[PDB]
Every structure is written in C-alpha cells, then in structure tokens.
Write a protein that binds this DNA or RNA. Sequence first.
DNA 1: GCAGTTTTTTT
DNA 2: GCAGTTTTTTT
Lengths: 240, 240
Amino acid sequence: LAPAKARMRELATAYARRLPGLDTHSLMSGLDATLTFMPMGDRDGAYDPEHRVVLINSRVRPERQRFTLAHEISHALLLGDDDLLSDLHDAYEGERLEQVIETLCNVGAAAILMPETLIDELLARFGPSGRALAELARRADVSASSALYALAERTSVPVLYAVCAVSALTVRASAGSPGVKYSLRPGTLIPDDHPVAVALETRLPITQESYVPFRSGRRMPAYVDAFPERQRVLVSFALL
Amino acid sequence: LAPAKARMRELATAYARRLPGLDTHSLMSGLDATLTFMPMGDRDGAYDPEHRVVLINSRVRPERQRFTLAHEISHALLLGDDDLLSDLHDAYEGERLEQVIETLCNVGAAAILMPETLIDELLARFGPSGRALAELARRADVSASSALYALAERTSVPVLYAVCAVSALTVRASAGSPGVKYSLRPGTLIPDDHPVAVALETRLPITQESYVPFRSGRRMPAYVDAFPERQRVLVSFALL
DNA sequence: GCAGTTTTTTT
DNA sequence: GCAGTTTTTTT
Ligand SMILES: [Mn+2]
Ligand SMILES: [Mn+2]
C-alpha cells in the first residue's frame, strides 16, 4: 500500500509542478474538466469522469473546498495511470479497494496542497512547532487538521502535534511524527494552568517546558510550542 | 456502432427487467449508487462512479429528470461491461469516443424508459399515430420528443412523426420511421387550415387525408393523425 | 491505519 | 447521424 501511496505522491507532485499557482482557481489548470461551485448539502464534492465535471460544495468553508478539489483531482490522476490502477485491482477488492482509493486520493490531495518544499521551508524557519503548524495552514490555505497530519509526517524528531479549541479547551485533532507511539485522543482535556490554555487566554505564543495531559493522568514531560489563534491553539509537544 | 447500440440495448433491458417498476424512484433499485435531487443550474445530471453518486437537477421538468437518470444509469452499465468498453476503445478515440459513449447512453436510457413491450402495445391499440405518440409520452413518463424518436424507430411503415407547438404552430421536433428519407425541419410552419392547427384550435383529435407542409412548398400527400394536447399536437404523417 | 475538521497510547 | 426538448429532405 505504501508503494501505491508513493506513486500517488509522484503523480500529484508532477501535477502540481505544472500548475501556475496553488490558488483555488489555478488548481484545475492541468485537468481537462470543468469546475462548478454549487450548494451540495451534505456532500462535499463529486467528479464525473465521463462528462469531465468537478462539483464542489459552495456552502462549506474554503479550506474544505480546497481539499475536496485536490481530492477530486487525485481521482482523475488515478483513473489515468492504468499501471497503479492495475496493481490496486490485483491487491484489493470490493469495499477494501474503495477505502484504499479514497485514502490515496486524500494522500494525493495533501501532496498537491502542501508541497514538501513549503513544509521544509517552515520547518527551517520555525522548527517542528505549533508556530510551524499555524504557518502551514495559513500559507497552504488548508485546515489546521490537514496541515497537522502533513507537518507530522515530515517531522523527523519525536513531536505530538495537536489542534485545540474550546468545546473548555480540548484536543480537537492530533498526530505524532513517524516515531511516536503515544496518542492524544480528540477530546483530551487541556488543563487551564497548562501553557496551551495560557496561550489562548493571553493570546500570546508560549515556548516552555511543560507536559502532555494524557487522559490516563500521566503527565509526560515535553517541551511545548503553542501559537494562539482565534479560539484555537496549534501546539507542538516535543518529546525526548 | 450499431453493434454497440444493440449491446447497449441488451444491458439496459436486462437492467429494466430487474426493476420493480419504471417509477422515478424504482429506477435506481438495480444500482449500487445513491441518488440526490438538487439544483444544478445548467447541468442536468452527473454520475460519480468512484463515490457511487447520481446527481439529478431538481429545477428541470420531471420528464427531463427521468431521461437524465436513465442516461446516468446507462453510464454505469457501460463501465461494467469491459467487453463493450474494450470494443469502443479499439474503434474510436478522443472526442469521437466521447460522442459515441454519450449517444449509447441516450440509447440505453430510452431502452430503460420505453420498453419495446409498451411501444408495441400502443402500436396495436392506436396504430402508428399521433395518438400513439401522445400515449407513449404519458404512459412512459417521458417527453414528447423522446417518445417520438422511440416510436418512429419501431414503426415499420412510412410515417413522419412530429411534435408541434406555438412558437404560430411550428414543428418543434420530428423523426421518420426507418424507411423515410424526408425531413420536417424544426420550425417548419403549420398552415392554419391544416388539420394539425385545426386539432389544436378545436382541441379535438383529427384523422383525415392531408399533406406534409414542407418548407419547400411541396405539399406531399399524407394521411394525418393528430392528437391535440395542452398547446401541443402530436401528429403522424403516414406516407404511401 | 488514517485521520484531511475549530513510561506516560490503550478493544 | 442523432436528435431524447412544448417526388415532395436539402452544405
Ligand atoms: Mn474520493
Ligand atoms: Mn453522458
């Protein structure tokens, strides 16, 4: 499956090199298809390969629209590589094949929206930090969640990235870089004396040694980098 | 191409036999896909085979919605027969392949909506007539135009079917049965003394010997069967 | 894994 | 042919 994921990243990056820019309107430049924003209710997107139409839901937030669009573009890239398609047919089936294809298109979509070049630029400017996470979401015009998964994958040291927001600050989303085994489950509570909540209240960014507030009550030592945004904090728990 | 058209009729009829009925909501019963009616602006329909979604425009008239739906269903039937698909790949290309596929799906769609059984039932009850045309559109829940093309194809004698409506009664749509070479171009004018206009004005159906009012001014003898509806007349010009 | 959205894990 | 929608043909 990782082979397929690699090949999907290849196609998507080749696609995104050919694009003039990553603005929402330049993304469809390398595809013989038309794009229509309209109200789609619950559905976020659709790609009709036979009539060459991409439909994106106009009622959802821009960052979602952008990820759905790159998802749908990756659907096209996949239908165009009969080799990758052939391998998947010889390796999966039925419902399993469906999930594999959907995951690959999510992979390809992040590969279009967030080039390794941008992630490494921020990594060198800001380190594997809450600040880098915040900057990635803004500079790539993606949601904090998509940026977190992308930033974490490219982080070569032990770090547990998280997105927190009142819901009562709680972990809304989180991922660890390749080596990490620990998991900060969504809804894990943020103590009010913890720098992440201090960041949100003070509205200032905080770098300092603190702890991961796992639900088990284990306070695992970590160095926290928290960047406060509007009712949300993007944080990096660096582990030793 | 006719081979492909035949094979498309095979799949569609096999599909429609399995259906409980031809009501708009039973048509999607034999397909692992979901159907969503929503406002689609200019577009009439879309089929996403990867997410298994059929989208039909809610703003267009029911008869159109019904034809678009059977069109989209025929798209699915085609993606499922790799043999028919293979032949088309070995026979057409690029834009030509696109039109071929679209025509076949229109073929399959009429085959779903209008079974030979229904057409022959009306042919035996009403003859190759304007009345048969009218009854076909109502009993199949299709537009007069789609019924005309279907009825004409199954008419074994020389007849030029037409749909006329004020636009000034003019030929809005027309087709001739297999043998006919003449063409009653859309916009051909209906003289006000001609029984078709008499039918519309009297609101009574007329069977009588008359003539085809070709634009060339040639009044070719024909036996007319005209059934008056709401601001429209479905007529059969039987030729010798 | 896969999430794509505001020694510290835990079917 | 392909339209799928209210001797009489005519790039
Ligand atoms: Mn998808
Ligand atoms: Mn089509």
